[PDB]
């Protein structure tokens, strides 16, 4: 991003800590839900309790 | 005579029965001093009767 300081502009770079921080225009919610179902299938919880 | 005005209002404007009056119905006694001050509006009685109704309502409650 770009940030404001006293009468000045500054640039800011910071890390996206977790997968979810990726924008929902590039990593949309349905993709995340299907990935969760993939995890469920991995854990033999395909029908969850 | 304030008594004449009070009897006139009670009997004509408000049309109360003789068995209940400002002597035996104190909130009416307090409201009659206000009502006598309103010389006009004696032609329409329903407004005054409804006003006394809601005064009795606000006089008695537990909330």
């Amino acid at each position: 991003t770009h940030c404001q300081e006293n009468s000045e502009t500054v640039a800011l770079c910071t890390p996206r800590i977790v997968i979810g921080n990726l924008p929902d225009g590039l990593a949309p919610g349905p993709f995340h839900e299907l990935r969760t179902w993939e995890i469920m299938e991995h854990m033999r919880l395909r029908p969850p309790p | 005579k304030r008594d004449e005005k009070h009897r006139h209002v009670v009997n004509v404007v408000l049309e109360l029965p003789t068995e209940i009056s400002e002597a035996t119905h104190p909130v009416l006694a307090t409201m009659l001093s206000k009502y006598t001050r309103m010389s006009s509006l004696f032609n329409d009685k329903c407004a005054f009767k409804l006003d006394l109704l809601r005064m009795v309502a606000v006089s008695r409650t537990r909330r």
Binding site: - | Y35, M38, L41, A47, F48, D51, R54
Partner: protein
């Protein structure tokens, strides 16, 4: 009326004291007797719904 109302034509209702004059008006056109309470936008939209 024939002309939009204004703060003078609107008059608040007293709801509990002997507001005789508005009773004497009752079926009156000119004065708009209204509660002093107001509807916020959200509850206004709920009414409209």
């Amino acid at each position: 009326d024939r002309q939009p109302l204004n703060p003078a034509n609107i008059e608040a209702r007293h709801h509990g004291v002997s507001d005789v004059p508005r009773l004497g008006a009752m079926d009156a056109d000119e004065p708009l007797f209204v509660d002093d309470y107001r509807a916020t936008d959200d509850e206004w939209t709920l009414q409209k719904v």
